[PDB]
Symmetry: C3
Subunit: 450 residues, 3 copies
Amino acid sequence: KALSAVILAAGKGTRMYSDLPKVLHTIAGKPMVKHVIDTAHQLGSENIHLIYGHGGDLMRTHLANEQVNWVLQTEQLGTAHAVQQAAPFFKDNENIVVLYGDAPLITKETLEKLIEAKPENGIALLTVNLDNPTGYGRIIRENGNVVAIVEQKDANAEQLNIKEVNTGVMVSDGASFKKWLARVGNNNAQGEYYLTDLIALANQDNCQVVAVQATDVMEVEGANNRLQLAALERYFQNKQASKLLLEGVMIYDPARFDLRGTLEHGKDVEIDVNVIIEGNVKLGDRVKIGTGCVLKNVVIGNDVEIKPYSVLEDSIVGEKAAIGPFSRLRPGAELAAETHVGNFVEIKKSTVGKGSKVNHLTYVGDSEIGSNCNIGAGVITCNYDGANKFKTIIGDDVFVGSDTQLVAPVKVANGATIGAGTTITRDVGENELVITRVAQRHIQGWQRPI
Amino acid sequence: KALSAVILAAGKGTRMYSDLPKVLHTIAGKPMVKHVIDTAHQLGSENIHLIYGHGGDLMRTHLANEQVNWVLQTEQLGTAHAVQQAAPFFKDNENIVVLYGDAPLITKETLEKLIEAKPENGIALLTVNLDNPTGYGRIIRENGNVVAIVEQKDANAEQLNIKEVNTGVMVSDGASFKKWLARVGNNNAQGEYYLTDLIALANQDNCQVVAVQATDVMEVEGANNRLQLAALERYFQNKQASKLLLEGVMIYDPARFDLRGTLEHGKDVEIDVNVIIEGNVKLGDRVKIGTGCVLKNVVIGNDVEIKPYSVLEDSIVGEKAAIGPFSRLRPGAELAAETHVGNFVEIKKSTVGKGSKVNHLTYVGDSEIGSNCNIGAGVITCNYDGANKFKTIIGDDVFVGSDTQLVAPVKVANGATIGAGTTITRDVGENELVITRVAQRHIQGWQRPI
Amino acid sequence: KALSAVILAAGKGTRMYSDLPKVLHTIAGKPMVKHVIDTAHQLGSENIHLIYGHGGDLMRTHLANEQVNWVLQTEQLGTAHAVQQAAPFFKDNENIVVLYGDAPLITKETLEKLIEAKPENGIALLTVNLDNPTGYGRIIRENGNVVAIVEQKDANAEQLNIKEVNTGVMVSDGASFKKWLARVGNNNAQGEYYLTDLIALANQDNCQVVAVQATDVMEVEGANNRLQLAALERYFQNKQASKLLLEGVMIYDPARFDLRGTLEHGKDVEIDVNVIIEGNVKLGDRVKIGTGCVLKNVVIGNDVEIKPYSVLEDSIVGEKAAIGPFSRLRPGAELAAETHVGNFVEIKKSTVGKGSKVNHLTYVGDSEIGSNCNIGAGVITCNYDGANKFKTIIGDDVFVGSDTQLVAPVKVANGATIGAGTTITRDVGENELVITRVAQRHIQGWQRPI
Ligand SMILES: COc1cc2nc(N3CCc4c(ccn(CC(C)C)c4=O)C3)nc(NS(=O)(=O)CC(F)(F)F)c2cc1OCC1CC1
Ligand SMILES: COc1cc2nc(N3CCc4c(ccn(CC(C)C)c4=O)C3)nc(NS(=O)(=O)CC(F)(F)F)c2cc1OCC1CC1
Ligand SMILES: COc1cc2nc(N3CCc4c(ccn(CC(C)C)c4=O)C3)nc(NS(=O)(=O)CC(F)(F)F)c2cc1OCC1CC1
């Protein structure tokens, strides 16, 4: 059969103590609900029906590009009534999986096992065994077969002893859902339609209710507060780190590694402790990343070593280049092959050509630097106090002496030499040597405090 | 009844291999004994009797402000004799809890349970179950009731099998203590009065000895060496991190978070991995703290983002300000709302006014900077080689060009413009433009090494 | 008896996905096989027979100084045939222990227990119990005594139930090895001589085969991929951290500590979270190391505090000196007693004399600085665009003003004073005051954009 999904994402998440709605809280840099959407799609869902409510505007701005059918929940009438709002879109002959935007770790493999165990015209539900089943809905079995679910507040002494609980995740065919949902009543103190009633309605229709137990508890675990979110984050990071390790990436300590995005890697990549990878990061062969580096949306060529406490964003680094320690690459930094970037160096929106070195205490912004240049310590690109930010153009084989200020817009042609302590405001021609003429007083026999 | 406490804090701590005495070793930045004092006070103790001895001078300097009664132990005659020194201060009608300055994690709740289980004229003692009870005093029970305690060196084959051990923590009324303590003899090889004898003396007086078992082993655990101290530190940090998480603080990884002081927080506060919080730190709503930051005695307004590897001490930061990465705030740094502090910037004892930006490679000390100023890269506040450190005063809307040295004492008035590479020694007036006139040699056809 | 060892180190390590051979992958900064060699030597081995093959050239370059007998494996004919290549070197009357260069954690103590349990003319083998023995060779016991080993692919339903497995580690006398090895046939599908056959051959010779069970599973664990390597690294680091803690080093969190080399320490040494120690590091008494520091091949005198995010390599630091935060010591940095090195300061191949201070935004290379000097913020040592790197010599009691460039080769004698913003190219004499004479335009009524 075909498949479509329903994700409940309307909940408030009061225990989060947040102006953000529950499902928008992130795991590895992306909202909980987004993980669930991706799994639903990877599962093969034709449609994804996102049921939303609380913090609606924030949902729509934060998930604008998500390939989903937006189903707004006006009146809060319980989960069965919410899914019923998505029900008119169900095709009779397709399976419908119900998921929760606050249980982000649910896997493709487990859901595939659940679908395949669904009997024709029946229900398949996910259940899980807990040492302490307190608070959750108990799974009721008559002679092996599943007949009902009983919540804590209704459970008798013996029922309270059942260690198998309801995860809320279930699969059934479209027509069955439409059929059973309509027959759910709200004769209760809270006056709302509970999704769990569908188990009894299937049994009363003499349809099979197969439970599939999940081996991994965390997979069906929901984050109701930030302690629980942190537990989920750590599990998810460990899962990501294990994969990379078995693929051949050396992570010196997976427990001190963070991937918040996607990583593309070559072979013999080494990643030291306390490194954070964000956005889209591509690493070529034999790249070495030292402790405390942060890489966000970067492309690193082969044989690049990144020394400790370097921070890179939206940057490109050519093969055999050397970065760090304490280097800052800001958006738009392009380093060609064999370039050197050293301590306390900031590079913004600039191209640095092959073999050029920028080794200490320097700021380069809005600049184009050619090949084999020597950019001295204390060199700074700046602007006049004016309207917009102009560019600095440096050619090949240029020597820029220590503590020189390059005032944009300015051009320094091939082979030029610029002496230490210079203020460059006029264009420098090819093979031109610029020296600052200093004026100094020398005072003899000046004695310092003894 | 009323309550007072006795804390044994005289021990040497040889296995620490330290010139510091055992109890002065820190958990979360404060001495072990200080945790115990605070718990004793929170418990409701009228008096706290600190028994001290080894490293006495260090105790008195390190705990000067502690609201305690200082009881010096001259002769080392065992624990019963030490408590006896505090005994003349016990009121007959008050409970007395005995605690240990090297078991820092003991909680208020557990101690409340112990006190309430104390029978009139009886004793209540804390005990705990261990898989491996080796080395510790075994709890001896006759037909359910506690009669004696037997140490390893006296325990027979069967007694050595008892898994319940003595934590040393006990409660009894004042008069009872005075009474039983006096009756403790020292007829032993080590020739000292053991506190444990009080169990037998109570039983021989036909008084009840109720044991209260502690559920959490770490709570009654003492640190005898630094391995054990580290285990205690990690437990204590995890307890602190859990609280903050349930209160709504997002700590991306509680296992890589350190709080060594007190934290005050608003809502939607996000704290990335490897952050250390020391002293008194106040965080407003929606503050973002990136990886590797250290905050010590700071106040952070709403909506401030602190980028990675920033270190702040005794500083104030206004709302919507931007700090980091690689920023240094030293004591006396005050940043007004909407200010910008960037990489490799050091700020010491300075006020920076609203909307001002200090973005790269800069040192500002002893300075007052107004609103909407632009402080260029490489700008440095300095002094003449003289006696004391003078101040630099900058008004509103001032432009200070790159790599400019401001030589204090100097004043730069509202709207002044200072060109790159300048040395400012004379006061700069309002709307005054200061440009350095450069002298340069230009040499054509200078060829660099090929 | 005497002892010699055989280490199998020829394996490919395909699952590592590396151009490095398996055994050259590092634990704590040194190749797996090197740990095994050191243990073999500490055990008391007269000879160490290194069997090698895959990535042979890399082995020989990476292990050049290892005191071993290099035994090249040309034809890959199974492990029994490999050890047979080392067999002509075995002395009849010595014990021979067989080890694996990919099981790096094997200890001296466990191997001593194995040797001593070896019966005369018999075999002693290491075995270990596993919950899940899947994939490994099962230990077969007849009435308590060890008779054979059966691999997964030959194991029947019941044999597959045996939870005791073969670690491959074994001891026997030289003559016995030579004797049993020769009698190993290769009548199998893979056509290779298996070392395990020696158990059956000993039993058929009516010789005792004693198994010694290992209590610690990780000790006999081999790293076949990088996930497993990381598990081994973490175990090994925790073992190293525990030792240091019990010796009196305060490591605030052993789970965030990394030692990749050797550490020599005094008393009351404090090491904050996320510190990496590499090469040979010596720490005197009461040294404080803050978070995120990296120390590689350094000597730190007594009472030195190293503030956070400092990186030191091949450097020497005198007693009571102050380093950091954000300080860089590059090879050849020597700091005398009571010196100060502050934020965003880089020091390369330079000596800094007693009480001198280098506190902000400074680069010192190839320099000699005397005692009690004041090196201002923004000070830079540089060179002319020439052939080699020349030296800067500064005497005692020199004041070097902010943002001064020192152009080597140059000498600044005792008691000289150098004003801010200076370019020093000529030698500065004793008690000479050098001030830069500035030329400035002042323009009144210059109004900035409103
Ligand atoms: C963010 O939005 C959500 C998320 C959500 N998530 C979950 N779950 C996700 C979390 C969860 C669940 C079951 C069990 N555990 C315990 C675990 C298996 C040990 C869980 O953690 C189910 N249930 C929900 N409702 S439910 O509990 O009634 C579902 C039921 F489990 F079937 F009962 C639910 C409702 C919801 O609001 C939409 C409502 C308004 C229409
Ligand atoms: C720093 O000063 C201390 C701290 C201290 N602490 C402790 N404890 C604190 C530590 C402790 C304890 C019991 C059991 N465990 C094991 C645990 C429960 C698994 C412990 O770790 C008791 N006992 C002490 N003495 S004691 O062992 O005799 C107390 C007794 F447990 F009752 F016996 C004790 C003495 C002491 O010196 C003062 C003496 C000179 C007057
Ligand atoms: C890097 O080089 C190596 C390392 C190596 N290591 C190991 N081991 C080391 C790894 C290992 C081992 C046994 C069991 N476990 C599981 C554990 C005890 C739970 C292991 O992890 C043995 N065995 C090896 N061979 S073996 O498995 O046949 C040895 C046997 F275990 F006796 F069978 C082996 C061969 C090898 O190549 C040389 C061959 C060409 C001559």
